[model samples]
Target: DDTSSSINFLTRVTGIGPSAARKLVDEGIKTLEDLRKNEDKLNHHQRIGLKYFEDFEKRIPREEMLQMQDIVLNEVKKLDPEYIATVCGSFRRGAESSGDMDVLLTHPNFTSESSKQPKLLHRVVEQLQKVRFITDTLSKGETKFMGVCQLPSENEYPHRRIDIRLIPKDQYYCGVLYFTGSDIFNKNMRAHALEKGFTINEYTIRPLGVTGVAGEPLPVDSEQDIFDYIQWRYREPKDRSE
Candidate 1:
């Protein structure tokens, strides 16, 4: 089924969705072979989807990754110098190489005025979209936006994934847990939370009987506070894998 003709099948193979695949196909992405050769025209999302394409046809290059990083950093710096932004995932894990950049952002206060958050994200995207460094806007929400872009200096580097997530101060700790993850460690923490009868997600951990089930999101002052509330020693991102 995965190797079938549908868009979902393509998505599974390339990390793009129906909308993106349709757009690509309309622009001439009829088969994997078409993508492999047209690397010059593909966008970031498409490039990322075909990250393994080189394995199928050619080799992936590193210059592209570095260029994309600079583009993302510059856009973020313009977005808000006060905003804390970090590249996590494989990059933070110290991989010798990375296919895409995963960036996490939080306002100085940890929360933007409810209405202004998305506006800030939109403005950032607007700036990024102006340059050839990025292209193809895909999915977006108040808290997150995912897209594809290009890096000309990199060999046929097409669309590479850029995920920007806006975080509220109240949810910062859990957000950190998620982004700083070795998924196993994050899940183990959640399991500990659940066994203690608390539900843990990127937002909060709450005792089933004592806290607001659907009330205002609780403010988490720091990562340590999250650990203290749960009666566990604080684990650093470095410790997460261990």
Candidate 2:
């Protein structure tokens, strides 16, 4: 029943419920070596997979990162205005260059309680493609996308690795701060909280051991002062410039 290769027939038969299927699966007979029925099918797929996994690994200037963000932001917004998009990581930290473009996306409709919107994420990604913002795709999923994107063909920009994440609205701020990491920031911020009797994670910020367990979590939105609570350990004037 398979349309491609001899290995495809093996896959279909192994997954079907029958004596032969059970026999082969029990014996683990679908091993790539056994599947020599095709021209090193596993190796062929491995090469394809590695190409997507490999990245440019070059640093892109901050201006280009922001422009990429703006381009995706507009496309997503046009599809669904309620969506929230932010250029996190190095871009958020005001760094001069970035290793990749990371955008955190959220919609009020997607939440921790129940996210049943199957098309919510795909629509934006498709629109991104329609706009030519997404050039190549890698890891494709409901909550995350790893791909390549670039400026329009009229420019000199190179194809760059881009990652998109769709998170719950309630955790948007925590996700923002968590994803804003240049990695060092996360480690230092986490270390700062650990010693002070709190644990910060991507989803929630919990105050530890007021009574041997965490109490109500601090509700955070994408507001300026929400940082005030975590910045509680280090406080002074004039740093508000950020």
Candidate 3:
């Protein structure tokens, strides 16, 4: 019974599924300790899945998500008052418990082409690390950051996973739509967009050409604009979990 329970637990880990769990368990890799010894057998994501086996599986309560959102908002605002930040994903979808926090960040003055030194996104990340909030960085780039953060507290608190992405102001809503997605919903929406002769993705939605070439990116001022362009009624973020 406990061996079955262990396999069930392994399935809940990010990037791991039932089949792989069964294989590991059969190979005498039942506990976290044993899995670590077989590290060479795992892929990149599975390695991370094993590394944070405990931390990554913990659910973040909505209350804590709000607290983290406030901390990020205020911290980044200190660098530039006009910065825009939103905690999206399952959190924005209004889930009571979330596996990770995904934040969308943008500023009126910052974009992919910005020539500014120590760009706004970089500065924000630096400020967070300086305050000892961001404990580890899984990956980072000009437009996106993946890391772990913890709330300021005297007692020990589990590290929470986080992502901060820089989006252009013009494409902010589309970015929000994509990041706030339940993947199934995004897929359905994309399929519908294609049927309407439009190509949709995280960055922008564009019209399709006669021969299927992607045309110029459409100007979208709101998430509703995307739905309208595709002839579908808008489904609010809260209703997007499909």
**Candidate 2: where is the Cα deviation over 4 Å?**
1-55, 210-216, 223-226, 230-242
Predicted structure 2, TM vs. truth: 0.70
Identify the leading candidate in terms of TM-score: 3
Query: Residues 12-83, candidate 3, lDDT per residue (tens digit)?
Result: 655578898888888877777777888887666577667777777688998888888888888988887888
- Candidate 1 CA-lDDT value: 0.65
Error of 3 at 87 (Å): 1.5
Report the candidate with higher TM-score, 2 versus 3.
3
- Models 1 onward score TM values of 0.65, 0.70, 0.75
Between candidates 1 and 2, name the one with more favorable TM-score: 2
lDDT of 1 by residue, 181-212 (tens): 77887788888876666667877766666553
Model 1 regions lying over 4 Å from their true place = 1-30, 33-71, 108-116, 151-158, 195-197, 210-218
Model 3's TM-score against the true structure: 0.75
Which residues of candidate 3, in runs, are more than 4 Å off? 1-52, 112-118
Question: Which ten residues in a row are the worst by lDDT in model 3?
Answer: 110-119
> Tens-digit lDDT track for model 2 on 64-146?
88788889878887887899988877567677788788888888888877766657877888888988888777657888887
- In candidate 2, the residue pairs with backbone N, CA or C atoms under 3 Å apart (3 or more residues apart, or in different chains) clash, namely none
